[PDB]
Amino acid sequence: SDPSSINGGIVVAMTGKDCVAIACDLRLGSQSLGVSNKFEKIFHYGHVFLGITGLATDVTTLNEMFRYKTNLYKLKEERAIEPETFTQLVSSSLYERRFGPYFVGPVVAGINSKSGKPFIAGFDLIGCIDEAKDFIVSGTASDQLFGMCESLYEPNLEPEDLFETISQALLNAADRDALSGWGAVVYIIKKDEVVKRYLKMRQD
Amino acid sequence: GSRRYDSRTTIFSPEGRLYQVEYALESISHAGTAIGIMASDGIVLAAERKVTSTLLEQDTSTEKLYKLNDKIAVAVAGLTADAEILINTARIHAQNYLKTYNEDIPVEILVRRLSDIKQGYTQHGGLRPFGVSFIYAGYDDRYGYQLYTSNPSGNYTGWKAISVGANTSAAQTLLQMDYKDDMKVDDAIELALKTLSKTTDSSALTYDRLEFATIRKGANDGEVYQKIFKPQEIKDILVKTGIT
Amino acid sequence: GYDRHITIFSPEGRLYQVEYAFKATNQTNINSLAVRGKDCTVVISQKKVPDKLLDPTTVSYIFCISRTIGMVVNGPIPDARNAALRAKAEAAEFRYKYGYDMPCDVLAKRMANLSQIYTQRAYMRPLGVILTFVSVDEELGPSIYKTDPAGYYVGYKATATGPKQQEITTNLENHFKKSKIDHINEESWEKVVEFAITHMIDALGTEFSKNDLEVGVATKDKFFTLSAENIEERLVAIAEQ
Amino acid sequence: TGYDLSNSVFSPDGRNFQVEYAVKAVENGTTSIGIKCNDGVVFAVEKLITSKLLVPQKNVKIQVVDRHIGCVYSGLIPDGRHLVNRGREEAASFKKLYKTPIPIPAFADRLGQYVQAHTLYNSVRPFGVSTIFGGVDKNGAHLYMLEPSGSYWGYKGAATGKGRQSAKAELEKLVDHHPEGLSAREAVKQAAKIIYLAHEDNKEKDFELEISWCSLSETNGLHKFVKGDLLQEAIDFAQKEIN
Amino acid sequence: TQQPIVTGTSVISMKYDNGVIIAADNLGSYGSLLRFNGVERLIPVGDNTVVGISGDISDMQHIERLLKDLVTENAYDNPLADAEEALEPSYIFEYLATVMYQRRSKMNPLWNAIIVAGVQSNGDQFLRYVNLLGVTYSSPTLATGFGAHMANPLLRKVVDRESDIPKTTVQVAEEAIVNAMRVLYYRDARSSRNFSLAIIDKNTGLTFKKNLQVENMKWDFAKDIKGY
Amino acid sequence: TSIMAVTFKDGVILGADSRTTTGAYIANRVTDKLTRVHDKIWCCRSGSAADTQAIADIVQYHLELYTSQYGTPSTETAASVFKELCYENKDNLTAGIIVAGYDDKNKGEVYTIPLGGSVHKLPYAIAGSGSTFIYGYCDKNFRENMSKEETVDFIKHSLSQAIKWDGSSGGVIRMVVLTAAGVERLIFYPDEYEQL
Amino acid sequence: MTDRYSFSLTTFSPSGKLGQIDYALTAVKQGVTSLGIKATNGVVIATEKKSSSPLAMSETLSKVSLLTPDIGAVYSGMGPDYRVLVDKSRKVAHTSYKRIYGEYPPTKLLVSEVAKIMQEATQSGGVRPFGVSLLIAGHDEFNGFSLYQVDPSGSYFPWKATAIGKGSVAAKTFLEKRWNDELELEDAIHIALLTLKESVEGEFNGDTIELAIIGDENPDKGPRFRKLTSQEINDRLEAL
Amino acid sequence: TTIAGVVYKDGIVLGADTRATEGMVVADKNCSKIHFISPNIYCCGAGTAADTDMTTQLISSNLELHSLSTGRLPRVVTANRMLKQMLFRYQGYIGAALVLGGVDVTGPHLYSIYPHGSTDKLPYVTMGSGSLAAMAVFEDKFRPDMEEEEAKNLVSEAIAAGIFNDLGSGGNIDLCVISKNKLDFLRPYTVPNKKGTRLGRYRCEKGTTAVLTEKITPL
């Protein structure tokens, strides 16, 4: 009965040369019992990508909530929300539930369409923004992901190289965690193309 | 007390009409004309801006045509400020439905709720009604393309072609004359512009006094696109049909 | 014509209740005046006690709002005291919330904002008063700010209010044309009080005993009113020159 | 016009006609007075004996607030009771927070602000009373008079009701003839005289006299009614002066 | 829910032929610390009633203000406030009993035990107890807290039943009360030597005695105690 | 904390140490526990720093608003406002406050308000964790109608001992003198008081 | 006290007119002239400081208000009504926008929020409409420079250039002739000073004119809103 | 976290480390902890990080509105009051531990604000897990009325003490110097640790990861 480790799962994001990557596993369980191997944790609102780990009901709820909020934004603003702005919206929304929080670990990823700059960010369950040049990690194998990213990562990787780095970071981290894995998805994001790849990984 | 200064906005006349609703409709009849035409492969929305000045910024302007979601738009006739209150309510209502059911809101459901809000202002609360008539243009996978209208009474109805605002009597006669069921979008575009051109209180219909939009399935395969026309695109479509 | 009974617009875009509240301002038949020194701000007002049965010490239109801010009112006493109690409460709350003494101009703006609400909301009448606030602000120095039933407010080099306000105003305008400066170039508040009384005498064309006047003085870190004997001392000094 | 049909409406003069109409109700009421003295205040009132069937001494009109303040009023009697009830609440909440009994000027503004509040809205009616009140606090004696507009001042002597002008004239003579001061026991006797003299303006029905006082030396700074030997002595003093 | 901080100990009392006697010491304890040595815990209401209070002193001071405020309120529009419509002991008690029970029922009690002693209009002796739970009872002798255990046994030897009240004079009753206060000072660790006593008689009225002391103290036998 | 207030011939003096702790760490060694609620009404604060600071601020606000309407409040009135806050919020407060002020009618006055929110008017008062160690001393050495110099010495010697034995007390001894003459602030350093 | 005015004080008349809105617009007509002009690299807004008395310090009365660092406002009509709209405009820019998105609202949306507040005074119980027309000039990253007018009804329109209040009919004609799409900011200030001279009766200088610009950043960003000084106006009046 | 501040001759010097932690893990090595309140007032933050960011942002917003209305620069005492009164109302549940420093019309002022709503007004303060290490430096070397470059060095030295000796603190040293004539926001002031150099290249070559399916979509 620790809300952030009932269902399991992980998300990681990285930056490269004029690109960003965000990846997640596919497991949803109930403690020891694996229930679903199709539960994606990465969503998008226009060109801004959001990954969410933690309690799966809150993952779903928050996706629905940010879709709602970014739809209204776009109608009023007459433009797509940018990553820097969305990051602030996520923070505000989480801190609104300060003493009854959503049990989640969200990760923002995307390229600002005006400046061309790759952007990633992470949050705690209560809204504190963690910005990074390099990588953001989240979920039940966050320790494992921190270790993988800190040793594998280098700056300014080409999209094809960055794919290999982020995939190896996720896979090897997931295999040292009982509650993560069961399939994986990687998103490679360039200024005006996005490539989504499913990874082959061990299914135990 | 304050009884002295109460207009009693929600009462019946001896004839069984609602004073304030009737007077709001009289207000709307002086607003710029807006026309909706439903074709088999799309919908046209056309509206005449209220007497323009040459120093008005035309491109960054919105007065008549508003987007409610990706599948539904409205043409406005009446007080713009009143319309914006209602538009935001409608926009939120659409998003509530999407959040609840994970499906885009069916057009009639949205129209009914907006119309129900208007009705309330005529039965309780002692406030003036909204001085607005809407043309709703939209698509859903149940009924396909749909046109509706609502007015300050909260009454709504569905149409193949319809006008609101000024000179609706003349506009409706002209639409009734040239409309047919097998019509295409590009024909409907022409009918809309021709009708406004004849009913207008201006000397000649020009690009700078018009707002124009289409809702087509003319994207790529089985999906709906909203095109709010830019100034230059209205200038081109006005030349293409030989009005200017 | 119910547009003259509540605060809604007439066909010519006017608010008659606001206009009539301005006429209530002069109902007391009292004239006030405010000027600034180098170090101080002096306010003076006429004191008329017609009834012999009145306790003259309790008849006042000058209020000590806070330690630093004083306020003179032109208008009926019930509305005047309503304005005063609110101003006191507002200035106390400001100090609690924000940790420093409410400036004269900020209080003025606040009371003007309250007045504005009564000109827009129907259930509340305007107060038939004009409020003149005085202090020596720690940032802006000697300050005079004035509020009316319209919700208007502005700062002043000097000012006057009442039935015979225009006479006093032009008298002051003519002095500042001559002196070429924004204030009374004087060291002591005692002489700025003397200037204020002297120029009121000239403009109104009347002489004053000690009981015909009321005087408030603002200095750095306190506002205070003068006793009958303080004013008498001041009247003697004018007469001996 | 119509400016007089609704409370809180300014006329084109800048007047609130509804308040002025409340003043008419006060002018119609019986005479009440207040006399400030050396170390206190004295209150008196005319009680019209409508019928033989009224129990004497048993329809008391002067009212105490806290233990040190006395209130008397002319006009609509129920409106006066409503004002005193509020006064009692205001005095209670002052003593609750600040411990000390409410000072008289403080108490005066509590009534003043409350009465003024009933001229701010058309959903209330102004008070149909003028109230004479006062007592003894840490700074000595204070006498006040409060009117339907919310206007109040401190007084040496005060009068309201049908015989106010007669009583005012009589009060002004006392102020002129006693510049040093009047004693509490003297002021009681004078109060009786003035009510008897002010009764000439209401002389169809004969009346009953009611007096109260607060004095630092005579009542120990507390409000007390004048009864028995001291009352009959004050009545006899008044009877001698009318003849 | 709270906890009592500054506290008063026993209040003791009894009936006699013409009236009642009540007494209490002048100490405000702060746990084991004997903090305040000048606290009056007998509070008179008019000239016919004395309310003796034990327990929390902050709550006692609150009750003191309620009684003071009750006297003010009774005087309002009451020409007979010093005569037929004066406050009776039975009125004052019932008010306090109502308050005490209301407060326990909101789970926010006044942390006290109270004895209301007085004489009524018709000369009848009034003596009744109420506490933080709203529990009430009357008896020829009443005592709170510690006094219930030590004072009552001594006082009941003077008045054991109702029929002993007419046989008990004011001298015998006052001796018994003062004697009981001595016994409490020997044996109660949270008591003091200094106390107040109040007699309410139907003939002689209210007599309030301050700055009394326990005297005639037997300590001599202490010198002959050697070890355990 | 060791705080006290003592009435004397010309008025009243308040005294306090300057130590604030979290367990055994001294968070502030130069604390001011003597705080102004009016020109000549001051208080000594003990208990929770946050609670006493919040109370003192509310009281200062109340007395400022009192002054605006009714002029200078009595010391009794100030104590009553403290009591009202302490008593009604007893369940959520840890505040032991001594209130001390100078009137011209009443001269020097001391009111102590312990944890329950009771009020006690006394010739002098001691409070705080360090007060326990000086009850014996203060009772033996206090006299009524002392001079200014005697009262300063009485407070200095007393708080010196309270500081010596209480670990929660220390730093400097601050004092505030309240008389008809005005308000005087005194400070005494370790090198003076420790060797008394 | 019961606020019993729970009903609308603005209602439709038989002709379809909303009386109180029209009457509010008449109040705007009586008010002092103010204008706004949009250049390629900036926007200018201007008005006359109509001093109620020469003893009054007209510097203290600011007709031109900063709403956000990149947005400014000016009005014609009732000053107190404007002052409370500026207070609400500033507050709504923080509560409903900056505390959510971590940036200031774009000009069009802040305008939309002010417009909403004014609409509600036109429909809610027991209130009259606001007796002001606003001219709001501003800049934001995605829309660039813009200028908007807001009326008592709550209706708002974007403008290349316009005027409101006393001499607005004459001033709008003057601007139609002079305005083009290749104006620099200095050229627009020059045209603003020319247009405003027509409607002013008395003294015409930096102490009687209030003029602000939305332009380049003045050293995260610097603020684009700048209020011109009394000296800066007088310098441009010599090259007039 | 190690945050600190001193009052020097001309004004205020604030200081902070840059380590953000998630339990025992470092989530950000160069995280900013000195927050903007107003142009003349800044606020170092310790305790719960979200509470620190949101509390300083809210009070910065409310002070901006206050300053627009009054037309004058805000004071530190009002920043202090607004933070204090809010934190008190939430009875410690908002875990914000702030070092508030700025320069008024009344001169330079420095405060420490605690989660429960207590404040101390002091010439030097330290907060966070590294407060004892930092306070040792101040007790060793602090004197009143220091020159600018001396006060800078003392704060830097006090943050360094926290960086090296406290495990909760680390990374770079950020300073903020506030006086009447200037505001100097120095980030980073010092880089006391070089980033550890890696001896091998562990990055995988292209095609190494096993893919199931791919999808490309343009924007």
Ligand SMILES: *[C@@H](CS(C)(=O)=O)[C@H](Cc1ccc(CN)cc1)NC(=O)[C@H](CO)NC(=O)[C@H](CC(C)C)NC(=O)[C@H](Cc1ccccc1)N=[N+]=[N-]
């Ligand atoms: C040092 C303060 S300390 C260790 O001495 O108490 C920093 C101060 C700080 C860093 C960054 C910022 C950003 N502007 C402001 C202040 N504090 C931290 O590193 C804290 C450690 O307590 N870290 C956090 O609060 C982190 C934020 C990280 C994502 C970057 N959040 C958590 O650890 C949350 C806390 C929490 C809150 C409510 C309920 C449960 C847990 N843990 N989680 N999940």
Ligand SMILES: [Mg+2]
């Ligand atoms: Mg696994």
Ligand SMILES: [Mg+2]
């Ligand atoms: Mg398995």
Ligand SMILES: [Mg+2]
């Ligand atoms: Mg009104």
Ligand SMILES: [Mg+2]
């Ligand atoms: Mg020690």
Ligand SMILES: [Mg+2]
């Ligand atoms: Mg607490």
